[PDB]
Amino acid sequence: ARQVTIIGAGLAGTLVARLLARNGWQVNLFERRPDPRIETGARGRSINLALAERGAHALRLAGLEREVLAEAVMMRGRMVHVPGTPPNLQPYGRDDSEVIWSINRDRLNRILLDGAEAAGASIHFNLGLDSVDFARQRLTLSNVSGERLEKRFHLLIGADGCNSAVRQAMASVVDLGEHLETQPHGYKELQITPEASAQFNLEPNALHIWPHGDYMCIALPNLDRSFTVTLFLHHQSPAAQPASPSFAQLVDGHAARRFFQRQFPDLSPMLDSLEQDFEHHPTGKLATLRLTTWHVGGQAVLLGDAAHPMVPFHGQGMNCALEDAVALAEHLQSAADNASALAAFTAQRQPDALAIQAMALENYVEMSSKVASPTYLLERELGQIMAQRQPTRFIPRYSMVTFSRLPYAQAMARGQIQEQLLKFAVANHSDLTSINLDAVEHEVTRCLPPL
Ligand SMILES: Cc1cc2nc3c(=O)[nH]c(=O)nc-3n(C[C@H](O)[C@H](O)[C@H](O)COP(=O)(O)OP(=O)(O)OC[C@H]3O[C@@H](n4cnc5c(N)ncnc54)[C@H](O)[C@@H]3O)c2cc1C
Numbered sequence: 001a002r003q004v005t006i007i008g009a010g011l012a013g014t015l016v017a018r019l020l021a022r023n024g025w026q027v028n029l030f031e032r033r034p035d036p037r038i039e040t041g042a043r044g045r046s047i048n049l050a051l052a053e054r055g056a057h058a059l060r061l062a063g064l065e066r067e068v069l070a071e072a073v074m075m076r077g078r079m080v081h082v083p084g085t086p087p088n089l090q091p092y093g094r095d096d097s098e099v100i101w102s103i104n105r106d107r108l109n110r111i112l113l114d115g116a117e118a119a120g121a122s123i124h125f126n127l128g129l130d131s132v133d134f135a136r137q138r139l140t141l142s143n144v145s146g147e148r149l150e151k152r153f154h155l156l157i158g159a160d161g162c163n164s165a166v167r168q169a170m171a172s173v174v175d176l177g178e179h180l181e182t183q184p185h186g187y188k189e190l191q192i193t194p195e196a197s198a199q200f201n202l203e204p205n206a207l208h209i210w211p212h213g214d215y216m217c218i219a220l221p222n223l224d225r226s227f228t229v230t231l232f233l234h235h236q237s238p239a240a241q242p243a244s245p246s247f248a249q250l251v252d253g254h255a256a257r258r259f260f261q262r263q264f265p266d267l268s269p270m271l272d273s274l275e276q277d278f279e280h281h282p283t284g285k286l287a288t289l290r291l292t293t294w295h296v297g298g299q300a301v302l303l304g305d306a307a308h309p310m311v312p313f314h315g316q317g318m319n320c321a322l323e324d325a326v327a328l329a330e331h332l333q334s335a336a337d338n339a340s341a342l343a344a345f346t347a348q349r350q351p352d353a354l355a356i357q358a359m360a361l362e363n364y365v366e367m368s369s370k371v372a373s374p375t376y377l378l379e380r381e382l383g384q385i386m387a388q389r390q391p392t393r394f395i396p397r398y399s400m401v402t403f404s405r406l407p408y409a410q411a412m413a414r415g416q417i418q419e420q421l422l423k424f425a426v427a428n429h430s431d432l433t434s435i436n437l438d439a440v441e442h443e444v445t446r447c448l449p450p451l
Contacts, residue, residue, distance in 0.1 A: 001026045004332075005139075005153040007129045007166050009033075012304030012321035013159025014112035018062055019329035021119035028151075029121055030141060032128035032160075037110050044106070046191060048220035048228035050075070050207065050315035051101040051108075052402045058322035064115050068108060072101035073221045079206040082370055083266055089206055098403045100207065100315070102220040129160065132169035134299055139169075155338050156300040157328070162289070164306035170296050177292025183311050185215075185364075186235045186247050187284040190277045194225035196270045202227065209367060210264050215245060216368045217267060229271070232368075235283070253278045286311050288357050294346040298339030301346070303328055308353040313367060314360040316401065320408075324349060355408040359401060359415075366398075378431060379422040382440065385432075389441050392450040394418060406451065417447050 002025050006013045009031035021027040051059075051072060059065040076099055077091040092098045117123060127141040127149065139156070142148045158166025170176060192202065202208065204225055210217040214234065219227040234246040245263065250256045253275030260268040268274070289309040295301040304321030328345050335341030372380075386394040397415030400406050406414075425440045 002332075003154040004028075004157060005030070005151070005155065006157040006159055008158070008160030008164075008304075008306070009109075009113060009116075009123055009125070010159060010161055010304070010321075011108065011112065011318050012306075012325045013157065014109065014116050015058065015062060015322055015325040016157060016159060016303060016329050017116040017121040017123070018064075018112070018119045019325065020332065021116060021121040023329070023333050025332075027116075027121040029116065029123045030127045030129065031123065031125045033125065035113070035123075035125045036106050037113060046222065046226065046228050047105040047189065048102055048222065049105050049108070049318050050220060051103050052316065052319045054316075054405055055319035055322045056101065057405055058326045061326055062115065064111060067111050068103060069101060071107050071111075071223060072103040073223060074205050075100045075102055075207045075221070076205050077207075079203055079208045081208060081210045081266060087203075087208075089203065093399070093403065098399070100402065102207070102222070104222060129165040129169075132156065132166065132172075132300070134169075134173050134296060137299075155298070155332075158300060158302040158306040159304055159325075160306050162287075162305040162309040164302065166300060167291075167302055167306050170300055170302070174293055174296050179290050181288040181290075183286040183288065184234050184236075185232045185286055185311075187286065187312075188231045188233070188247075188278060189281050189284075190217075190229040190231060190271055191273060192219065192227040192229060192270045193272060196272060197221075197225050197227055200270050202270070210267055211368050211370045212263055213368055213370060215263075217264060218367070229267075247283050250278070288361065290354065290357065294350065295342040298337060298342055301328065301342045307349075308357060310357045310360045311364070312360070313364040314356065314401065316356050316360060320353065320356055323405075352408040355412040356401070359397070359408070359412055375426060378429075379419075379426050381432060382425060382435060382437075383418070383422055385437060386440060386444050389437075390444050390448070390450075393448040394444050395451070414448060421447070 004020055004025055004027055006017050006027065006029045009029050013029060017027050017029045056065055059068050074096065076096060077089045079087045079089055081087050092100065113123060126143050130140045130142050132139045138150055138152055140148055140150050156166060158164050160166055204221045208219040215232060217229055217231050219229040221227050236248045237244045237246040245259065250259055256278040257274055260271065260274060287309055288311055291307060294307050303324045305317060310317055327349055331341040331345040335344060383396060387396065397411060400411035400414065421443055425435055429435045
């Protein structure tokens with residue numbers, strides 16, 4: 001049996017461990033954190049994630065989708081909150097076929113861990129990768145208290161997240177051609193209790209957004225009617241606009257409270273533990289990192305956040321990571337040798353990773369705008385007309401990304417064609433009055449092949 005060592009029992013690492021192990025591979029998976037399935041007296045994390053068709057399908061192939069969805073809340077649409085103005089649900093699709101699932105990150109992780117072990121993978125916790133000797137095919141791990149352990153490896157999979165140690169190690173033997181693009185927003189996780197969300201009649205089967213331009217909040221529901229809220233806000237005010245809100249200004253929980261009372265007055269009443277959450281939950285960092293190479297010969301490869309850190313504004317990092325896991329296991333299973341598999345995997349996934357990284361950056365503007373411009377309303381309306389006329393040709397980009405398995409790069413290409421098509425048709429027309437719809441439709445049939 002072929003042997004593989006995987007670093008990182010997160011989302012991609014644990015899925016790929018299952019897929020390889022059930023195909024007969026001898027799999028050893030190493031994880032820095034303790035086993036989350038071993039219950040302790042400690043809290044438990046309420047981090048939420050949006051699971052979309054890509055990620056769901058990857059779990060489906062692994063035989064885990066039913067188990068995961070049993071513990072997921074359906075989000076049928078977006079609830080946009082603007083002060084006053086009673087929240088209006090914007091449905092994703094026309095029935096519950098087109099939905100996004102809200103799932104607890106650590107619940108998902110436990111299910112994946114069970115899945116990997118059921119398939120035959122051996123999982124080793126409390127062991128973080130420190131370094132790799134590629135020439136001698138050995139690596140060094142250590143626990144939190146630093147005592148070290150060495151292991152031989154044959155094939156190394158870096159599924160160890162956005163600060164990948166495998167990636168760091170590879171940079172010693174190949175030029176990764178890395179370029180880091182920092183992002184000015186930080187994030188803070190906050191909580192709405194089940195009592196609070198019921199009291200304010202917050203819809204459980206929706207994704208909620210409080211847009212506010214340069215900053216915003218989003219909330220995803222949990223099975224117990226609590227919500228996990230994320231604030232996205234600049235780390236610092238520009239020297240340009242020093243007065244503008246930023247984490248630097250929010251010097252403590254009381255400052256955070258005044259900020260929410262002023263800028264999010266309808267959300268603040270729902271955040272009972274705002275002060276405490278704010279001070280005890282560290283501010284997170286966001287970034288996009290792009291790599292020229294993802295592998296070292298047939299010896300090591302990167303997967304998921306290790307390969308392509310992205311900003312979280314499209315809710316697709318997990319989805320992309322699980323999709324990566326399927327692709328990597330597919331290539332490894334059937335290739336002539338590991339070097340061939342890793343090159344083919346990289347060639348396949350790299351253009352799709354670049355596309356979703358770009359689309360995720362673009363999606364911030366869509367989400368954070370408090371109201372839509374007059375002409376963008378007109379384009380969206382013409383687009384829905386075209387979608388009705390040619391539903392296999394005109395598919396809104398968000399829907400291609402979120403509710404289909406179309407490769408990200410094609411979703412982006414078709415999305416580009418569609419937006420341009422809408423702009424020329426919309427120009428100099430105040431409403432759908434002037435716009436000859438059937439002229440636009442064979443413009444659609446011209447440049448958008450049916451799918
Ligand atoms: C604010 C925010 C919101 C998000 N929302 C969504 C969403 O709604 N939908 C979505 O699709 N994605 C979302 N994402 C992205 C998502 O969290 C990640 O893309 C995804 O977890 C990446 O999966 P992964 O397996 O590659 O990495 P991870 O899930 O991060 O797992 C990496 C694993 O490696 C371990 N590890 C790290 N270093 C070492 C080491 N040296 N040795 C051993 N083990 C190590 C870690 O402990 C961890 O278990 C969000 C991200 C953020 C920051």
